[PDB]
PDB file of C-alpha atoms in Angstrom:
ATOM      1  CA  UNK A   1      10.266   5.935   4.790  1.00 22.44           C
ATOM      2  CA  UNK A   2       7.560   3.426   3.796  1.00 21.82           C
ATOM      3  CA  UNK A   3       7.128   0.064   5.765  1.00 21.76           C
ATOM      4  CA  UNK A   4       6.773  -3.476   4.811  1.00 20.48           C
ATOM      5  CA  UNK A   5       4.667  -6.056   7.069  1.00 20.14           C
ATOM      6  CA  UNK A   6       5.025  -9.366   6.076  1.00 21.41           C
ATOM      7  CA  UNK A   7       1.788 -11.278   7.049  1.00 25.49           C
ATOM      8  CA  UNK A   8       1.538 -14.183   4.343  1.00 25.55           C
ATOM      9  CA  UNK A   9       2.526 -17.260   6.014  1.00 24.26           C
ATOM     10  CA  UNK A  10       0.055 -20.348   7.041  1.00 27.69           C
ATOM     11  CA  UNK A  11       0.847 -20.146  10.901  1.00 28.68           C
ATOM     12  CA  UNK A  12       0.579 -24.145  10.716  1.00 28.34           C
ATOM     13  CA  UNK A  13       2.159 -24.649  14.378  1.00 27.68           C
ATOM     14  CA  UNK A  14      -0.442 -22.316  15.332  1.00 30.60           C
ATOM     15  CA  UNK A  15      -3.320 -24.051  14.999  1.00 29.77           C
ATOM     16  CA  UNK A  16      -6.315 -24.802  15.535  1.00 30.89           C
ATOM     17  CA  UNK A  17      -5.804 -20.941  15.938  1.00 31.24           C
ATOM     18  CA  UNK A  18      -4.875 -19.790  12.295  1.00 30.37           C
ATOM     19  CA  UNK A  19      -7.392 -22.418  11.113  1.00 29.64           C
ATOM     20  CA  UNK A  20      -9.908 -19.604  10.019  1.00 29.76           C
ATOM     21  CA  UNK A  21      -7.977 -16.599  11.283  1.00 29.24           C
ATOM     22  CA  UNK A  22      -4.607 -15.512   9.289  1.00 27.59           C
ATOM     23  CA  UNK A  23      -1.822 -15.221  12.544  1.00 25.18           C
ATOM     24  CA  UNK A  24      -1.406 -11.531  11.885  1.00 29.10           C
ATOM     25  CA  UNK A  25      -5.113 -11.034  13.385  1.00 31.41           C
ATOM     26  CA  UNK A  26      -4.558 -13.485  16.372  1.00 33.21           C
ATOM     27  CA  UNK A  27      -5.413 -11.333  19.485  1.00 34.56           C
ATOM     28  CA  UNK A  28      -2.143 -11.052  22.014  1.00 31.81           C
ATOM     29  CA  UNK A  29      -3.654  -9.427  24.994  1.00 32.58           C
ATOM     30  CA  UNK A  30      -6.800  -8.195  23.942  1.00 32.38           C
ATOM     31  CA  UNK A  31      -4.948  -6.918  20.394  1.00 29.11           C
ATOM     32  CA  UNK A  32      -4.291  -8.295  17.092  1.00 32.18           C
ATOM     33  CA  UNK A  33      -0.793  -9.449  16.474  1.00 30.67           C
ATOM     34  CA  UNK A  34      -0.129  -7.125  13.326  1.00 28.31           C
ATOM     35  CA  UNK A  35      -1.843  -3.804  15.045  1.00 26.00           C
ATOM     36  CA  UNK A  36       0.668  -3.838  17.764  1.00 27.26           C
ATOM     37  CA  UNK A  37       3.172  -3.168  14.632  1.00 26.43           C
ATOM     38  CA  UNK A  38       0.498  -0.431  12.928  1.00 24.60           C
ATOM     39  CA  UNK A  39       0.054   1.793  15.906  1.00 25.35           C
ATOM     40  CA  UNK A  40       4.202   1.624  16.873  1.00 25.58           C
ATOM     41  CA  UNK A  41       4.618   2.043  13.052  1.00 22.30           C
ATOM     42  CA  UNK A  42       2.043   4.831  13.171  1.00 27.86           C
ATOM     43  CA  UNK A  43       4.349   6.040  15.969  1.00 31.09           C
ATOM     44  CA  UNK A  44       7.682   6.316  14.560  1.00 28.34           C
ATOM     45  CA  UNK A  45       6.213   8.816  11.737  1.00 31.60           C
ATOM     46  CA  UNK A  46       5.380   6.123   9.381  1.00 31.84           C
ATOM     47  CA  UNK A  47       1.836   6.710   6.882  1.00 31.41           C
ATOM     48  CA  UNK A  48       2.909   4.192   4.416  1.00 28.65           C
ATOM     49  CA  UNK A  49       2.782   0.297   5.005  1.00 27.21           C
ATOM     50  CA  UNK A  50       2.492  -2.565   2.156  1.00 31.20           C
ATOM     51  CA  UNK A  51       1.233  -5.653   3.474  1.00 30.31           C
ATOM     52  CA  UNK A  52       1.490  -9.206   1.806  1.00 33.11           C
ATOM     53  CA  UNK A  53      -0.938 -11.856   2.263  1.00 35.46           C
ATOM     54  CA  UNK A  54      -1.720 -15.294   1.052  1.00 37.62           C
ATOM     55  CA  UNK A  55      -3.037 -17.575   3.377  1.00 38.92           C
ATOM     56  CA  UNK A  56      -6.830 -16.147   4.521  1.00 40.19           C
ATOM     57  CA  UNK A  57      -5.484 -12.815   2.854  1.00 37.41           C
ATOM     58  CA  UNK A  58      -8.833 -11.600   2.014  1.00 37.21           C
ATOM     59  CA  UNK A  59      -9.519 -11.445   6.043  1.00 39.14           C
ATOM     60  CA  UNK A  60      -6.537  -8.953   6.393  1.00 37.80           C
ATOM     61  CA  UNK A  61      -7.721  -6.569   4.326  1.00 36.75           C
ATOM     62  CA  UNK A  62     -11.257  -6.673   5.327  1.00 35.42           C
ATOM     63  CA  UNK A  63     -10.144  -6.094   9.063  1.00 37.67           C
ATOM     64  CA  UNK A  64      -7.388  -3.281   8.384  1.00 36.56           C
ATOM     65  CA  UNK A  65      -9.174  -1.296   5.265  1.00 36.62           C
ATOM     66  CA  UNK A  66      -7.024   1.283   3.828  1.00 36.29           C
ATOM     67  CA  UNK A  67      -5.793   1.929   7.131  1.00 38.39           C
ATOM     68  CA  UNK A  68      -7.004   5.249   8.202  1.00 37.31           C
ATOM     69  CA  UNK A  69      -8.310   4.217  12.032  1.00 36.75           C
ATOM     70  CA  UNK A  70      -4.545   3.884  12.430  1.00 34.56           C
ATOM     71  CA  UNK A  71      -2.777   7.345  10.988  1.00 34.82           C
ATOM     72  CA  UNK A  72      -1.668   5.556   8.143  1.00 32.83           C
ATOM     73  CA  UNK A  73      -2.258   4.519   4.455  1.00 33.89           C
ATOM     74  CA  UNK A  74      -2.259   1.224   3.831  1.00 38.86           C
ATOM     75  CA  UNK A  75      -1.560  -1.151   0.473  1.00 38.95           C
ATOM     76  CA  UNK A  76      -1.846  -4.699  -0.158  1.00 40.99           C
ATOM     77  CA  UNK A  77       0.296  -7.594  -2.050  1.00 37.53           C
ATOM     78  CA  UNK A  78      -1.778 -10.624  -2.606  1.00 35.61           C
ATOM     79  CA  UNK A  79       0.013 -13.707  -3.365  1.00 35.68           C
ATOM     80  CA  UNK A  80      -1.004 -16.803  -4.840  1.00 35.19           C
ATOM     81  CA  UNK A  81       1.778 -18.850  -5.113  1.00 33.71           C
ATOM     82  CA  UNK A  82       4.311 -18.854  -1.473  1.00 33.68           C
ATOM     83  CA  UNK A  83       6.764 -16.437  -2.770  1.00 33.65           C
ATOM     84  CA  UNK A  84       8.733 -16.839   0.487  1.00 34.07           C
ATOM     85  CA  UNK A  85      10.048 -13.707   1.986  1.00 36.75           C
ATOM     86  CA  UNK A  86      12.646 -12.376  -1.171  1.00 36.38           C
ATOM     87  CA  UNK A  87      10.012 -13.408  -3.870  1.00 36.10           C
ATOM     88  CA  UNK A  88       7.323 -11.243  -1.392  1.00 35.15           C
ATOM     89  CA  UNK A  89       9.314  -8.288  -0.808  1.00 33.91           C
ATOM     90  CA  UNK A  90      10.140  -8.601  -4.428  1.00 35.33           C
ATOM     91  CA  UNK A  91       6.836  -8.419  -5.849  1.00 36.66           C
ATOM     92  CA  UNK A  92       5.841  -5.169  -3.662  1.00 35.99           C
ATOM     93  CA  UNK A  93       8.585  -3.493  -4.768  1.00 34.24           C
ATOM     94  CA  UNK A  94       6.368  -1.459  -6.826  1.00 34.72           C
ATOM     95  CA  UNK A  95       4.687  -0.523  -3.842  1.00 36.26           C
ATOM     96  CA  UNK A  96       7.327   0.461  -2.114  1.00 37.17           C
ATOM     97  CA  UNK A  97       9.440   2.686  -4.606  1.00 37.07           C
ATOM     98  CA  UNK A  98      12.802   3.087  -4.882  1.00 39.77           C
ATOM     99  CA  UNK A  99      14.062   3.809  -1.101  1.00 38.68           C
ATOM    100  CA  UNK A 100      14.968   2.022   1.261  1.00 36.27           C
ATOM    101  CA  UNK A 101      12.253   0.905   3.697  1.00 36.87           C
ATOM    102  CA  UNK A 102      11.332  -0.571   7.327  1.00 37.33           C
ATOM    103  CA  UNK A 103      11.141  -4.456   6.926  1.00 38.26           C
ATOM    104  CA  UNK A 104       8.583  -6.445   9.566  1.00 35.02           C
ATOM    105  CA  UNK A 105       8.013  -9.636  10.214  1.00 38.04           C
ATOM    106  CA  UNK A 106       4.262  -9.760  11.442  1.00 38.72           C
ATOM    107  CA  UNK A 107       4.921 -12.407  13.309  1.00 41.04           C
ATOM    108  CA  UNK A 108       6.676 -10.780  15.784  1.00 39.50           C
ATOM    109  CA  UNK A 109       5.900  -9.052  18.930  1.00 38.77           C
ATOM    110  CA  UNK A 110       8.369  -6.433  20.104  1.00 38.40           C
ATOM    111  CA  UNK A 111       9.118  -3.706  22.224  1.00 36.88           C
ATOM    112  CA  UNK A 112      11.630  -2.605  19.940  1.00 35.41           C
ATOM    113  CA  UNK A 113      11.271   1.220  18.969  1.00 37.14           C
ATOM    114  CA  UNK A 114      11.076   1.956  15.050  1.00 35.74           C
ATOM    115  CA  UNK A 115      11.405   5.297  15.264  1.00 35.31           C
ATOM    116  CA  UNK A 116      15.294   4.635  16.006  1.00 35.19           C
ATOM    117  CA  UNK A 117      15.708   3.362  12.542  1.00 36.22           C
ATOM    118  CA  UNK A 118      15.187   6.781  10.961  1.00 39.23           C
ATOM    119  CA  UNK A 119      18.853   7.812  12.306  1.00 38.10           C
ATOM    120  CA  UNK A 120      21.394   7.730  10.232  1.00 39.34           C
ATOM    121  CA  UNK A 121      22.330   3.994   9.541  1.00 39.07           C
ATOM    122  CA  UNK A 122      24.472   1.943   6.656  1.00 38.65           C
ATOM    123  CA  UNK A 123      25.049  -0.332   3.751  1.00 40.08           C
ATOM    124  CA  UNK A 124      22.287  -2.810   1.787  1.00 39.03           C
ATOM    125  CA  UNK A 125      20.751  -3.269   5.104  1.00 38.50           C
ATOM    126  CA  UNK A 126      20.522  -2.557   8.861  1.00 38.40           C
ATOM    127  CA  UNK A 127      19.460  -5.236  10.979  1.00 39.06           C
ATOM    128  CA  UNK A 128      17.909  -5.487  14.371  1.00 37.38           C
ATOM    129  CA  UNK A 129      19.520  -8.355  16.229  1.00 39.24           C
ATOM    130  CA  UNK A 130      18.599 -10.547  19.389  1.00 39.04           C
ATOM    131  CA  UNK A 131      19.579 -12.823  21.536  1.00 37.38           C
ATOM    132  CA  UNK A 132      19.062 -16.232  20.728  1.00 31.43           C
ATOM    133  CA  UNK A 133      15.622 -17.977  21.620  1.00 29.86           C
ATOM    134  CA  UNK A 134      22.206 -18.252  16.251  1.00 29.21           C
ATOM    135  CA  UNK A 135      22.624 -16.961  13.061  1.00 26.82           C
ATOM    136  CA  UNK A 136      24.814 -13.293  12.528  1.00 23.79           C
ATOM    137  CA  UNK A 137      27.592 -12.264  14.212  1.00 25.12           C
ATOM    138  CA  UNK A 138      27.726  -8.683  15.666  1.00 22.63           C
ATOM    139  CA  UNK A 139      31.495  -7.139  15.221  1.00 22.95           C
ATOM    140  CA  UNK A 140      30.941  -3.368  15.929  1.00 24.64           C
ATOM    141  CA  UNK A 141      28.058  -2.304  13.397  1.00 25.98           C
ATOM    142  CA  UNK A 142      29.139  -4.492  10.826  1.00 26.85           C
ATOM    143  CA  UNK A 143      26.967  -8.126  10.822  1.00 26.25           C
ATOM    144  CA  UNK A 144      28.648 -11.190   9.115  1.00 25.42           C
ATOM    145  CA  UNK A 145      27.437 -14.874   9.095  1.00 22.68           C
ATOM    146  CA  UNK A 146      27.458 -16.518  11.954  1.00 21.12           C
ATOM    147  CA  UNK A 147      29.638 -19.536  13.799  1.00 23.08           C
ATOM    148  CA  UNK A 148      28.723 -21.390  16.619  1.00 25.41           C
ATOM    149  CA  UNK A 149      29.445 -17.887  20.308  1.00 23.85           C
ATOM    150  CA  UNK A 150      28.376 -15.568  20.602  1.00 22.30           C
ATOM    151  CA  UNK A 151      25.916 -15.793  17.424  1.00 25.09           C
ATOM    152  CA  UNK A 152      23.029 -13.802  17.306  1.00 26.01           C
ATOM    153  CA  UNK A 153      19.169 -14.344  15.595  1.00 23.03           C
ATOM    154  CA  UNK A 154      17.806 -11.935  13.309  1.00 23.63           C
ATOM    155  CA  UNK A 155      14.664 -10.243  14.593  1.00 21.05           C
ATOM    156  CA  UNK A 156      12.935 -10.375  11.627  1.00 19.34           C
ATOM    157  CA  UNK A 157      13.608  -6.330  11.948  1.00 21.00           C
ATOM    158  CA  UNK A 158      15.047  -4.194   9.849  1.00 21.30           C
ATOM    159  CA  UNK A 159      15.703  -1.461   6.991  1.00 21.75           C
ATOM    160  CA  UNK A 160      16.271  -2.779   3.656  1.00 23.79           C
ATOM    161  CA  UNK A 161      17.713  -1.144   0.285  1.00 23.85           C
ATOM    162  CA  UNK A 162      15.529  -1.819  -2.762  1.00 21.73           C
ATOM    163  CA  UNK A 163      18.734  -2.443  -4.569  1.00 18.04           C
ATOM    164  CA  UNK A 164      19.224  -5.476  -2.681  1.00 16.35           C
ATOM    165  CA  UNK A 165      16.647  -7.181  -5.175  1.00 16.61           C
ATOM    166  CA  UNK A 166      18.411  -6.509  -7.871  1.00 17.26           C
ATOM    167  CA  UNK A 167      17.291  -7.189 -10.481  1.00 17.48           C
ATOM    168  CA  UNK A 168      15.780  -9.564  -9.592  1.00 15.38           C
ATOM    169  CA  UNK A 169      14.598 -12.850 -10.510  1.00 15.93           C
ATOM    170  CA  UNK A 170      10.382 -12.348 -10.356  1.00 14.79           C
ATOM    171  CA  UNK A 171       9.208 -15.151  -7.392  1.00 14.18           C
ATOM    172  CA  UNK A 172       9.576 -17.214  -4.828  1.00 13.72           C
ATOM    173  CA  UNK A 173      13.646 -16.865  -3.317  1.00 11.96           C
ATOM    174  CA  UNK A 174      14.520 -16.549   0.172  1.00 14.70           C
ATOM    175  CA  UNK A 175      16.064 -13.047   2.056  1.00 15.57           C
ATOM    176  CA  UNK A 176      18.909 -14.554   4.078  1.00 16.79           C
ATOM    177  CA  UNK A 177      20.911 -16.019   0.827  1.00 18.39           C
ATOM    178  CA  UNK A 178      20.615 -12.331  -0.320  1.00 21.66           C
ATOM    179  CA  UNK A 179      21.673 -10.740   3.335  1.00 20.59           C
ATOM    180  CA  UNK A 180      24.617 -13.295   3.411  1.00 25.02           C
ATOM    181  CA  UNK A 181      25.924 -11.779  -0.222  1.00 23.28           C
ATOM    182  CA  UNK A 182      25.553  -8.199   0.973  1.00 23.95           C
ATOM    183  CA  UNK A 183      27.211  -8.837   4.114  1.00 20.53           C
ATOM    184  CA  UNK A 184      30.255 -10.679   1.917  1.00 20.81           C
ATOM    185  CA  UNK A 185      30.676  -7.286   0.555  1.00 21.51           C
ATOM    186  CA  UNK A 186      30.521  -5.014   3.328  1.00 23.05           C
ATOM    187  CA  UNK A 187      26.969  -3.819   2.758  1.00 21.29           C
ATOM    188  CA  UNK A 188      25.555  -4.472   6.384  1.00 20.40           C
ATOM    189  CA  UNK A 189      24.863  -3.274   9.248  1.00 20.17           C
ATOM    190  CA  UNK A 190      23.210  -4.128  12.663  1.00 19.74           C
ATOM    191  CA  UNK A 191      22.860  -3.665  16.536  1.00 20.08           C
ATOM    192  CA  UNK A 192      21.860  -5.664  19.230  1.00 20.66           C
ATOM    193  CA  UNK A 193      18.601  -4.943  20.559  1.00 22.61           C
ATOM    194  CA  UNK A 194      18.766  -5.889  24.347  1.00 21.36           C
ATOM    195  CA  UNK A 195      14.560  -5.810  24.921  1.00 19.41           C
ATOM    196  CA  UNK A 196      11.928  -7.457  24.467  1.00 16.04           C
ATOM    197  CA  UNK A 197      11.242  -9.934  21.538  1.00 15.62           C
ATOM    198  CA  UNK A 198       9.093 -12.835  20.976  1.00 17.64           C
ATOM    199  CA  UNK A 199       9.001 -14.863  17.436  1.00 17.56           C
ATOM    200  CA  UNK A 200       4.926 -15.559  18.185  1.00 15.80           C
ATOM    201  CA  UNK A 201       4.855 -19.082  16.066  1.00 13.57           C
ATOM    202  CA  UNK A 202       3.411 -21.156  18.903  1.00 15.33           C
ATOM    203  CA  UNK A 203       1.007 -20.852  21.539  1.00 15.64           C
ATOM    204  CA  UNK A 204       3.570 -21.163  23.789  1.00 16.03           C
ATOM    205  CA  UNK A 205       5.581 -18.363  22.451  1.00 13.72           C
ATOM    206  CA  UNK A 206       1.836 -16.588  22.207  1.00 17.15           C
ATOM    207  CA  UNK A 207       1.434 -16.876  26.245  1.00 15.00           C
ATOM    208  CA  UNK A 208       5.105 -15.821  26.597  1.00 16.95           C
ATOM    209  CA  UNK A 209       4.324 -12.628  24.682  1.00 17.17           C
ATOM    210  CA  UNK A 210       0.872 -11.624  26.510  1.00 13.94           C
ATOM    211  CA  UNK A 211       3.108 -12.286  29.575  1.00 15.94           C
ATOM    212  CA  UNK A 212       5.747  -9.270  28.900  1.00 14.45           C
ATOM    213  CA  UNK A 213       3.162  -7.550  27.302  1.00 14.86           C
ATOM    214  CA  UNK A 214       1.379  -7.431  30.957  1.00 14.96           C
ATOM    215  CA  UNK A 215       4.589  -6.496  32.254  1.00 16.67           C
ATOM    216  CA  UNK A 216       4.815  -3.065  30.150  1.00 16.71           C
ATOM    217  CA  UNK A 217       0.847  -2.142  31.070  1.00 17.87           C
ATOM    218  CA  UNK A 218       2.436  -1.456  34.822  1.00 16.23           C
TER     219      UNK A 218
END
């Protein structure tokens, strides 16, 4: 399947770091932030990745190109307006076809492999969750809304059916209002992924991320 990197958002706690550099290109351990998910991506099998932009979008695309140094082919979704993650997702759609596909949060940095995503797995969507830094509730594989213990957080992870935008209401609309009505039904699944994950959103969570990234280089 095809993957879907969401890099659009400001990374305002991140300043003065995002001030002139879009957070997906802010170097954790000698790396940028979004090629940690490109060469893991690269990894798993995928050669297909759509990635939205916005704010300093024209710097993602002049860094990444069509994506070829990595193994894969890359596509862009400019947005103007903030579409927030549904309206985003909705408006590469076309991008993306009709099957389901891998869902990333750029933001992220994880140790979590993507290549276990191409088993078998069930319903609207699959979700990676982790332990809180909570939201979903883990019974078995089925996921259902949380109540605070014990809750879990979404990694921002995951394998999402088109369908699940339909039909769809064309931008700006959030994902979890839409992951809450597909888990009323049935329609999701998850695990818990025990590893490594850091939401990198401050510099804080930045340092904690080179930190277990130094770990994994011995």
């Amino acid at each position: 399947m095809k993957a879907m990197i969401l890099a659009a958002g400001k990374g305002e706690r991140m300043r003065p770091l995002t001030l002139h550099t879009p957070k997906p290109l802010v170097p954790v351990a000698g790396q940028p932030l979004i090629e940690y998910h490109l060469r893991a991506l690269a990894a798993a099998g995928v050669t297909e990745v759509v990635i939205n932009h916005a704010w300093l979008g024209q710097q993602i695309e002049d860094h990444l190109g069509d994506g070829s140094r990595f193994g894969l082919s890359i596509r862009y979704s400019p947005e103007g307006e903030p579409l927030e993650t549904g309206g985003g997702i909705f408006k590469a759609l076309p991008l993306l076809g009709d099957a389901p596909f891998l869902l990333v949060n750029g933001d992220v940095w994880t140790d979590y492999d993507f290549a276990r995503l191409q088993a078998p797995l069930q319903g609207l969507a699959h979700l990676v969750l982790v332990d809180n830094p909570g939201d979903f509730r883990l019974v078995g594989e089925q996921v259902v809304d949380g109540d605070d213990p014990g809750t879990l957080t979404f990694s921002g992870i995951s394998v999402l059916h088109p369908a699940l935008f339909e039909g769809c209401q064309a931008g700006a609309f959030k994902l979890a209002p839409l992951l809450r009505q597909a888990m009323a039904a049935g329609k999701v699944s998850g695990e818990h992924y025990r590893g490594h994950w850091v939401d990198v959103g401050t510099l804080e969570r930045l340092a904690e991320a080179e930190s277990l990234i130094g770990e994994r280089a011995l």
